[PDB]
Structure 1
């Protein structure tokens, strides 16, 4: 988990993004995109830096993130990858937009 006050807020957000409350739209972001399994044979040609919430959780648990900004960059990279790869009318993009709304509104409540 987070040690710094701001990293504890980040860890709180991460726990919320992984909670049953948001599972209906969070689930595509729980684990790395399995490009082979999903038939997305161009995924790793288009997405140079895959990211997902299990990777963010591992990095938080390993004290990889030194500040809130570094944590937020990985969460936003995950959404950006979704918006880059997927047609904007795909269900996964609607789910990304909803989960990013949850993220951005709570990230904005960061303690100073």
Structure 2
């Protein structure tokens, strides 16, 4: 619905807000494989995703429903878990931001 997509825009605003910056910063823009020295990133990760891409899709009304929005946000986190070992600090940062996302997404009115 239009109303659920409105709640999703509020979730995205929360994920981009200053209170989460200490763990959100790796996710604001696409992974820059050249800058980071990740020569195999685009071989391993076939469908990159990040918050700037989710924001553009929300602004252009490209999500048909709330579930399509959730699939892109979960894809962003899944790519991080897929690429990195489980002991890495970026994985701990992803799980902190994901817990914000999953809590707010669960509270969406029907």
Which TM-score applies when normalising by structure 2?
Answer: 0.98
Q: CA deviation at 1:8?
A: 0.8
Give per-residue Cα distances to partners, 1:19-77, cap 9 Å, x unaligned. Answer: 00100000100000001100011100010000000000000001111100000000000
Separation in 2, partners of 1:41, 1:10: 34
Partner Cα separation in structure 1 for residue 75 and residue 62 of structure 2:
16
Aligned counterparts of 1:83 and 1:55: Cα–Cα separation in 2: 19
* 1:77 counterpart residue number: 75
Name the CA distance, whole Å, in 1 between partners of 2:13 and 2:38: 29
Report the RMSD for the aligned CA atoms in angstroms.
Answer: 0.5
The unaligned stretches of length 5 or more in structure 2 are none
Taking the aligned partners of 1:27 and 1:66, their CA distance within structure 2 comes to: 27
Q: Give the TM-score normalised by the residue count of structure 1.
A: 0.96
Tell me what 2:88 maps to.
Answer: 90
Unaligned runs of 5+ in 1: none
d(CA) in 2 for partners of 1:9, 1:93: 27
Q: 1:45 aligns with which of 38, 43, 46?
A: 43
